[PDB]
Structure formats: structure tokens, C-alpha cells
Amino acid sequence: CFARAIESSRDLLHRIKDEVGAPGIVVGVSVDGKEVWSEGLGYADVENRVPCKPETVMRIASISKSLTMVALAKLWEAGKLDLDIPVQHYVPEFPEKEYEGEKVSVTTRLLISHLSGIRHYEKDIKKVKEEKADFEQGELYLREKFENSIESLRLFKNDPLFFKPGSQFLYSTFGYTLLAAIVERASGCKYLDYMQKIFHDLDMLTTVQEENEPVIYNRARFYVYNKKKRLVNTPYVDNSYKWAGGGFLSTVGDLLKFGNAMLYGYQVGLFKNSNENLLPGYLKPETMVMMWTPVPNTEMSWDKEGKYAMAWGVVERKQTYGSCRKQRHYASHTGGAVGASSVLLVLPEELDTETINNKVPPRGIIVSIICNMQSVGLNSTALKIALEFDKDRS
């Protein structure tokens, strides 16, 4: 039934692969909760000639923020965590900050949406202020091993705030390290154990953390181009200092399952009225709405047409003029890692009365693409693939 869409999507994948020169790429498409397509192109390892397969394990980078958000939402549902309380309640090791000698408060809500003052890789305030008005970074190529989140906090716990909390949007990865410390303090257990339990609940059996010593099957390699336009290996790095921000490894099936679970949790409330036999979602319907609610004064780098919510980028639906562009509602998050690129997209389906009365959730399309090439933007390709699979479905 999806044969026409599959061929075109494969053509689109070839287009992007040849445009960026990626040695390998893997895709995964799920329609209405069922996986209908999964393919790989190229070689996961070019030295040993290992072809790309749906079982390939690659580095999802910032899609990890979404997993941490799921953990935080579950903790908040359990009542252990309060969003508006200052972070010093849970983590007293973080020093209090001043902004030309005025009291400022850093909270979980500000940390989630990046509205907090914490910096990114750059340490020079002047350049950041000039830009507001890179893989060249050193901290991005660290190799030290950090046993715990509290030890990892020492990289940025002494730097001054760059902006007033809640005033300027600045994408950051250390804020989610602080969030992981808060999670492990509030839950009473280690962060990795909590995430492992969550992955077990969601049936994500191939999602593990970036480590070198353990043997991980079907692990791929990551490449980059040098100054002579020749494919080379990326340098060895250790990502233990940022587990929550970008330290996880996964496949396309696990991302499809995660997206399906989120879609079901989002859509179960609408279908609850017609049928009372539906199982409850992993998170409460009000929690799901809050997660996907856009926050004002936020930006979405991979799509200027939408904004940012909680660990997700959300584009809403609207139409301003007749016979003119009709915006479509979807949520997405992209990831950029040394040697790798990924994207996860969710496209909800507009629900009518008859569909609600007859059909059952989830109703939508989830698309996941991962490639072992550095600095590749895959949001547009995923959006096109999702739209075309939306056309075929009847």
C-alpha cells in the first residue's frame, strides 16, 4: 500500500546522501503505530566493508534531551519534583549567581527551555553578546572519564551567567547535565539506572550509553572530511561528562517506539470518550500537552517557522490568508555529534468526529534518520518523507 511512497522516499534519501557525501544512512518509518519501512544505504564501516542495516547502532546526540525530559516528566507526575523551586534545593553544590549585583533564580523550568543564563561551548561573553545582538571547540573533544554528575558539574559551575534567567534564549548542553544531577538527586537513584528502567519500560532494548570497554554489537564508525577533501576517521572522544545532553547510542526502531509512545500519550485523551477499553498512556494527557506547548521568546534552529517547547521543537498549524500556505502541526528534534547526524520527527494526524469514533490511537507518522556524517541537516528530508507517507495512507 505504501509502495509508491517508499520508492520516492528512497530517492530522497539518495539525494541527501550524495549531496553531503555520507558513507552510510539508515531510515525508519512507522505509520499508525506499525513499522512499514526500514532500510539502510552505504557502509557503516568503510575499513572492513560492513553494510548499513536497520540493526546498526549510531550516535543519537541531542535526541537524548527528549529522554531526559521523559524522565523529568515522570518524576514530576510522581510528585517528587517541583519545577519552580530553585535548583539549590536539590543541588547545593551549584553556587548562587548575581547579575550586576542583583538576585537571580535558576529553576528547572528555565533550564528545560534553555532560557537560563548558562553558556554553551564558548566562554567569551563578548562574542556571544555580539552574535546575539562549532566543532572547533576544545571541550567538544574531551577524553577524560567522569564517574558522576556532580564531578561533571565542575566544568561550568564557576562561570558567570551570560544573560538574565528567562530573558534570552541560548541553546546549551550543560543545563541538561545540571538537569541530570537534579534527576539523580530527586529520584534517590543514579541517573543511568533510572534511564535504563525507563528504556526497559518502553521496550528500547538497544539504547545504551557511549562507552568503549563494553562490547556493543553492530556499532558503527564515524567519519569527517579533511582539508584535502578526503574521508578520514573522527578523533576519539569521551562523552561521560554529558550523558543527558548527548551521550546515548540507539537504533531507528527504538526511536520509532519512543515516538509511538509519545504520540499515544498525546492522543489517548481525545479517544477516551468513545472507548473506555483503551490502556492508559505512559504519561498523563495534561503532561503531554505541557511537553509539546511552545514557549514564547524561543527559537527553533532547524526550522525558523516554529518555536521551542520542552526538549522539543514544535511547529503549530495556522493559516493567515485564503489560498495561501497552510501550516501543518508537527514536532521534531535534530542532533549533531562528532561524526554523526540524526533526526526524529512526529507528524500527528488531524482528527475528525468519525475517525475518533471509529479508529484507535496512535494516528500519525514517525520518521527517524541517522547518518555517520558530521554536520548534516536532515529535518527537511524527514518532513518530506512524512508528508508523502501521509498522502498514501487512506
Added chain:
Amino acid sequence: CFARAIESSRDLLHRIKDEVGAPGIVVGVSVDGKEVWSEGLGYADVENRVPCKPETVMRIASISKSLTMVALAKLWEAGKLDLDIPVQHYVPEFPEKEYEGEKVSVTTRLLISHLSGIRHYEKDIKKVKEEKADFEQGELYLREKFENSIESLRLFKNDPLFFKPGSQFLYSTFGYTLLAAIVERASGCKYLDYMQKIFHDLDMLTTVQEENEPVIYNRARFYVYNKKKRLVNTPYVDNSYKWAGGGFLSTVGDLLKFGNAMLYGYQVGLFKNSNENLLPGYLKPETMVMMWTPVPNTEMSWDKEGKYAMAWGVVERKQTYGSCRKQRHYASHTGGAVGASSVLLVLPEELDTETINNKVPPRGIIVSIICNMQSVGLNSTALKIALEFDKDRS
């Protein structure tokens, strides 16, 4: 429902294609805001045997003037631009002109309708005056790259005026280069960025500018016949000096969407009285009327029966004698480029009381035809296709 009309239209397309010997041709028909037919005949590329498809990208040439007019109308609605103010207010680099030593004023209104003195490709005043009482041109085969509109102005900013402003009609392309310079000066941003934003608003995702370095998918080739009556390739040209006049690339779907938007903006005022739930048009109803209002002392080359308005050729409706020709109201613009020919036609539907009370805008037919053959007139074929689709609709 349109099956009878589609077959006849295809026959008409074959007629014109065999008459001119065009290697390929693409058509697009929209009825009442919905695309009902789209087909291609022949080969977009004859060297590699690439068939013509609705996704083919060809060179719309002077249909670009309409896009610039949309930009100018939006700027005028915003209040940034004044039509009657002399152009030296925005562009002081253009020298003031004299006509046997008398002061003359060049304004935006004169530039839009070609009533201005600026010349076309020919530089000899005597021949132009004799004709008033060609692909053989050199400027039509330029290959230099021009970074900005101000740099492009140097090709004609020193030539004397050919006629008194507002006195003689002379179709010109450099006047729209001056218009683009005025647009980029008044809007505060670059012309290409403004047009890109406008195209994004109107959902024209495949409309780009003529460039060689970037990879543009489904780009076609352009051909001409030599002295031995053999098909050959057209010479390489650069169109950077005239973006506004004739430097864009598009498909038939984008032209259909543009025509539908213009038709909705034209017709929403009549339907506003019955229903208040209709979304506003892209431009105000008074702006649309002005755009399609014919201007006296103007000519319409592709149809002697009508006149010229603002970047459009408009034929009105009238009937002088009983049992004799009944003129029909429509608007059209044709384009001639090296190696290419195109046409865009809009046929509004006569509105009665019951149709206004019951139906919703837009009500009409838009037809777009593009072929990769030089010096082909497609206005009559488009008019016949539009009329026949007007017959089938019930």
C-alpha cells in the same frame, strides 16, 4: 467530470507542439482553486532522454514581472512606498534626464506600465522612432555576474530617454531592474530575500533564481533550431543583471498557486457580504482592483483586443452589437526567454446573486503552459483550454 475537456486540451497541446516542433511541453490546469489536470509531453532533456513531468523546472521569463508587482503592492500597502514620488528619492544613483532641455520626472507608476522613456535592448533611437511611427541582440547573451541591483544599473543609467515619460508605450525590462533597486532600497532588505519570503508565504517552494553553481533538481534544457533546421543547444547565458525582469525558475504548480492567490484576493470582496468567516486575501481588495485596471495608451502584444495594466495584460468584457461577439474578461502574461516559452492565464467567472450567496471564492480557472522552445506564442492555446474547461464545469 473534466474527462471530455482533458482529452480535447491534450489534443490542442499536441497541435501546438507539432506546429512549433517543441521537444517538450508541460501544462497545468486549476478549477475553482483545485488542481484537476497536470501533464507533460516530450523530453525535458533530449541528450539523456529525460521525459517531461509536472515536476520539471523551466525558465519563466517575464511572468517574473508579476512577482515583482506583488512585492511592490505589498510594500505600498505597508505604506513604505509612494508611487508618484520621483525615483531619485529612493535611488539617487540614477541621473536626472532632460528632453530637449525640459524637466521630466520618472516615477514608479510610469515604470510599472512601461510608459517611461527607458529603452529596451536596442540602443539606436532612429530605428525605434521609425518602428513606433530580437534574440539577435548582444545584451541578451551576456555572461557577466552582477552582485547587486546597483551594479546592474550601470548597463542603462547613462542612456538618454527615448520618449517623454507618460507619452509613449515602450515595453522594457531595465525598468523593472530599476523597480527592483527601488524595492530593495525602500524595504530595507535585499530584493532576493524579500522575494524568497513572499514565495514562502504563497507556498511556492520550487521558485528559485537562475544560477549555475547550486544543484537544482529536475532542471530542464533549452533548445533552438539552426540554419540547417536541426535542433541544437542554446548558448550559455547569465541572467543576474535582470532578476526582476526575467531571472526566475518555476514549475506549473507554483504558477497555479500564485494565480489562485491573486484570484482569491480579487474576488473576496464580493463574497465578504454574505459570509464573515472568510479569511482575508493576501492583498487588500482595492489593491487588487488597481493591479488589474487597464491603463490608457497601452498595448497588449499577445492580444490586440486588450490593453496593459500593472505587470499584466487585461482584456475586459463588452458587447457592442446584438448577436455579435461577446468579449470575455480575463488577465494574462506571456514570457519569452532564450530557449523557452511560457504563459499564465486567469479566467474569472461571472458572479450572480445565488452563486455569491452560496459558493465561496475563488471562482475561476488558471492555466499555465511552459515549453523548452524559443519564440513560441501560447496565449491562444491557453485561452482555448480555459474556455473549454469553463464549459465542462457545472
Added chain:
Amino acid sequence: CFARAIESSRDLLHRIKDEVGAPGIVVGVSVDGKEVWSEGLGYADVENRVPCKPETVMRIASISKSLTMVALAKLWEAGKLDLDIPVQHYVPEFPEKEYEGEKVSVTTRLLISHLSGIRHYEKDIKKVKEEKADFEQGELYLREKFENSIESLRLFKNDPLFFKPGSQFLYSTFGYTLLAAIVERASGCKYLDYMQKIFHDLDMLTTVQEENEPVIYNRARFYVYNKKKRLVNTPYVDNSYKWAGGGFLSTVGDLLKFGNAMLYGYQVGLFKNSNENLLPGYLKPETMVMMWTPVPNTEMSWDKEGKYAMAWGVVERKQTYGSCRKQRHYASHTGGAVGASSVLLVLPEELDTETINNKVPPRGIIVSIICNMQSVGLNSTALKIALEFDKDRS
């Protein structure tokens, strides 16, 4: 019989294609005068999605020098041309040159082996002398059309000599333009007509010159990577000023046929004694030996282990120490063009008494590889493929 070798060769081709990120590549292998393998990988045109095929026409660049050498050898056999006579005998438009006020002579023999003083793209003597002790060039991106070789001579006929003739090796392309002028003067006919006749004699029906106006079927596109590591189109260029140097277009089958003809002409003399029914080669046996004879004080850029002969790079066979590297005898020439890379390799087979008495010429392997990627070295891959096909043959 060659199934094992074919698979490995395909793997080698994939290796180089992924290493350089070439959108397409075509290979051709001939064993003992019969074509046994021919395949293409990737897309010849990425905008229109045209797959690579053995019929693809790409830009062989400096393999053209070999064709001009064949023309010169045939003229010398006919007795029309003398190698040691100064070039002013045939072309008096070339000015005589002095070297700190001493008489120097430029001859055909010096021009063939690049021992002449004529420069390459660089015009600064100091930098060339420093290097002796680039696609960044301007002359490499010319677009002017030159009707005849004498007109083309004006680009370098006034520059002073860089080194003493016969003293320093300097690879050059304008020397072969002078050679083409000499050919067309001595033969009494135009250079292109002579080469067309030669191609007709050798059954190379798809070998034509680089031109834009004529329709050439199966013509490919040429690409390069920009500063953002994104695939883009190469700029439009005109190669009319260097027909003999790098101005021809060809397939892999034509190169295979050319190599087979050269191999037969080389090897027919050894087999003449046993059988008198063998047809004569295209060139006399003594002429073939001279063509492949290495010249002292010459360099072979694509293989430091060999030297240069007449329009060919020749590596001889030798062994200095026991149980140590055994050199193999072969001839090759590589080509680098804007947007393209190519190689032609000939691997003669060692002949014994029984093989000479029983088998018939040609006995060897010819390999041709062309890719639409700029600055790719394909000599090593061709050598490996030839050696592996040498192993399978029995």
C-alpha cells in the same frame, strides 16, 4: 572465468568512490583483445537522476595527448614530418627565443617529451624556479572560442622560455597546442579532420571534441565540492584553445579499442616469425618501440617508480636483489580536468616461446576508469585491477 576478479574489482571501485565522494564512476576491462567487463556506479547527472552506464560520455583530459601522438607518429611514418627540424620550418608565426642571449632550438622531439622551455598555467618564473629547485589558475576557466590553432597560439607565443630546451622537465599543455599547429601545417588539412579520420580508422565512434551547441547523447555532468563540503556544479568553460592537450570526449569502449590497437602494434613483431597470416599493425613495430621508450631526465607524476616516454608514462621491469620486489612492465597516462578524472592503463604479458608459437596477439590487459569528480588519482586502482585480472587469466 573472471567472476572472482570482477567482484574484487567492483569492491576496489567502491573503495575509491567512497574515499573521494564521487557521484559516479565507470570502468572498462579488456582481456586478450576481448572486452570482458564493463560497469557503472552512481549517477552521471544528479539533478535529473541519470544512472551511470558504459555508454556515458565523460571528459578524458590528457589522454588526448596520446591521440595526438598517434597522429604525429602516422605523419612521421608517412615521411611528411621530421622530428629534429626546428618548429619554425612548419610554423613561422612562433618567434625565436633566446636564453641570456644564446641561440636555442625548439624541436618536435623536445615538445613531445615536455623537455621544452614552454610554461604551463603559471606565468611567474620565480615561483616555478623555486618549486623546481592548480585549478586556482585563470587560464583554466576561459570561455572564449578560438577558430584555429594559429589563433590559439597567441596565449603563450610571447612569453619567454622558462628553462633551456632539453635541460629541465616541465609538464605543459601549450606545447601540444603547438604540436597540433605543426600537425595541421604538415598534413595539409585541419587538425580536427585528421583526428576524425584517425578515430574512424580505429573504430572510435563516440570520440568527439568538447562543444556546447551540438547535441551529444549520453553526455554527463561534472561536479566539485565547495568550502561548506557540499556538492556543486563546476563553472562553464570552453576548451577550444587546447584541442590536442585536453579537449576531447570519450567512453570506456573507445579507450579499450585504442589500447588494444596500440598493444597489437607493439606485439605483432614478436609473433610475425611464427605466423605470416597476421594483419599488419596500425603503426610499424619500430615506431611502437620508440613511442614506449622512456626518455632520460623525465618524471612520471602518478608513479615515481617509472619515467616518461612519448605522450605516455612507462614503468619498466627489473629486479635488483633476490627475494625482493619484482618490477612489472606497463604503460599508463592519467588525466585531470575541471570536474573530471580518468586513467588508461596497458599491462603487456610476458611472452615465452610456446606462447609466441601458439597464441596470437594482442596478449595483455587494458583498463579504463573515468569519474565525474575533480582531482582524483586512479592509477593505483587501475594497476590493482589489472594485476588481479592478470591472475585469473589462464
Added chain:
Amino acid sequence: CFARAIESSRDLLHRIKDEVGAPGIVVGVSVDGKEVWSEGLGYADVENRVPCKPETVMRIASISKSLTMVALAKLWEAGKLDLDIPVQHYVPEFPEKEYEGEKVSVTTRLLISHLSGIRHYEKDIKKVKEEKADFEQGELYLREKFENSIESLRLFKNDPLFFKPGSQFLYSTFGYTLLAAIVERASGCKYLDYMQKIFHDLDMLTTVQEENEPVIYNRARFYVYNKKKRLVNTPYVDNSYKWAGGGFLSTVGDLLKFGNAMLYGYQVGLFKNSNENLLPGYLKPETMVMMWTPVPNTEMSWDKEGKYAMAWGVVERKQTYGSCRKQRHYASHTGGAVGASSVLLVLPEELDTETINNKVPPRGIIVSIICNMQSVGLNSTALKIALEFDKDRS
């Protein structure tokens, strides 16, 4: 002819592989200068399921010392190097050393046989003295990159001598770093370039240095067992500080070729009398004898029955009592690297009058075994395989 021996050797390889639990192992056997057997067992990479093949590239560790010795012998033959001159003549950056205030001289001859005072990984003199009367080391897991040998010298150039030069045998790896510095100073070129030229001369095309950025095909992985008796990956290390001591990567064919070249150079002098058509060896016959001459007061760790020579361990032939053990003459060197084990063995054949008069060199057997397992001794297995292949040969 060797079918009986091959099966038994394979059984022996299985025996050692199961005894040590090595995931993979590769063997290579050459008889009389011709490779007669080559096989691999297990997986080179267990995560991606890549089987072991003869083309696998693994870490030869201290077999590198033999390559440096070949370089030093060639330099000494050229007359550039003097063995008895103090090392301060070539490398003045090395400080002079005192031994309870007495002048001591460090020379190339002492450095070659490890009779020099320089330490190994351990820095505590007391423990070394107690042992004389480990992978637990820190310097063995360094990750810093060192551009040149002079920079690498700083790791041990300030430590005091452990024993009097020429008095006590102490195996060391930094002495060969000093030897590499001496080589690059005396030869006038970089060490890596000299070794690359030597490898090219000996037809060792797959022998490269340990580097991460370049793409090296068929590169294997290296494993170790943890405290829970589970297979894990070895930690990432950089071996740039010891190129000469333990930094090379190779296959079994390259080691076979190297051993064959050494055997030919050793045996050509005996066969020179009968036949004058034999090509000269890579090194002079007197040089080869010196290389394999055992040095008094030296030890051979992998075989207590023999001693040490120049970068080789040599066991001589002798028989003390009648009807009792008859010693056999052979040379060998083993290597231990993080995650890897290797051995190279040469078994010369006893030469009689008729064999010298009739046969041609080389006459012997070379055996190479490499496995991706840490701390495995393979000398006995290689000796047994060589002896059994010695039995089959007739």
C-alpha cells in the same frame, strides 16, 4: 605435497586458540621462498562479525625492532654510521651519564643488544635490582601525540642509568627510540620516510604506522579479559612515542617476504661459488652474519635455550652427548602489544654439497602467527609448525 602438514598445523593452531581464548588468529607459512599456506580462524571484529582473513592488519609490536635493525645495517653498509662512536656524536640532546662518578659511554652497539643502562617501563631502581639479583604500567597507556623522535626523547632522557653499559642485560624499548633518533640524524631524512622506502624496496605494501585518522583497510580490533572473565575492548592508546620499538602494523605476507629476504641474504654467500648468475642480497653476506651472531651475557625470554643477537633471538645448533638432544639452528622474535600477540620465526635448512651445487637459495621455512589477544606466547607453536613442514619437504 604439504597436505598432511597443513592439517596438523591447523590442529595446533586450534589448540593454542582454545587454550588462550583468542577471538581470532592468522597464520602464514612459506617454504623455499614460496608461500604454501595462509589461513585465518575466528573473527577480527566481534562487534560487527568480521571473519579473520590473510589480509587482516594487526599490530606487530616488537618485530619492528628487526625493521629498524635492517635500516641500521643498511646505513652502516653505506658508511654513514659507526657503531663504536658514542651516541652524543649524532644526538647531542642526550645528556652524558655518570655511574658513581665515573665516565661511561653509550654506543649504538650497546643500544642494539640492550646491554645499555637505559630502563624499561619501571622507574624504581630498587625493584629492578631486586629482580635482577607489565601492562599495569602507566607509560604503556599514553595517548599524547609526538611529532618527532627528539620530542619523544624527553620521556627518559633525564633518568639515571640503571646498570653499567655493557655489564647487565635489560630489555628496553626506549633504546630503540634513541636508535630511531640516531637513524634520522645520520641518514639526513625522517625516520618514517626511510622505513617507507625500505618497505617499498622489500615489497611490503601493507606495512604502515599506528595512526587513527587515516583510513586503513582490513584493520582489526584488539581485546582482553576483565576480572569477571568477560571479553572487553582494550583502551585507546597512542604509540607515536615509540615508532621503532613498537609502532608498526602489518600482515603475514609482509612478514613472510621480510623473512625470505633475510634468509636469501644469509644464504647467498654459500651458493655464490657454484653459480655466478644469482642476484645479490639486500645486505652483504658479512652484514647478515653479524646480525645473527649471538652476543655473550644476553638472554632470550621466549626460549631459555638460546641467546640474543642484533634485534633477534638466535638458538644455535649443537649436540653434547651421543643419542641425546640435537639442537637445531633457528632465529625468532616475539611481540607483545596491548590487545595483540605475534611471532616471526626463520628455520634455515642444513646445506650439503649436492644441495649447494644443485639447488638455489633461499632454503628454509618462515612462519608468522598473529592473534588479537593480549599476553599470548606463540614461539613453541611456530617452532612445531616449522619442524613439521620441515619433515614434509623433500
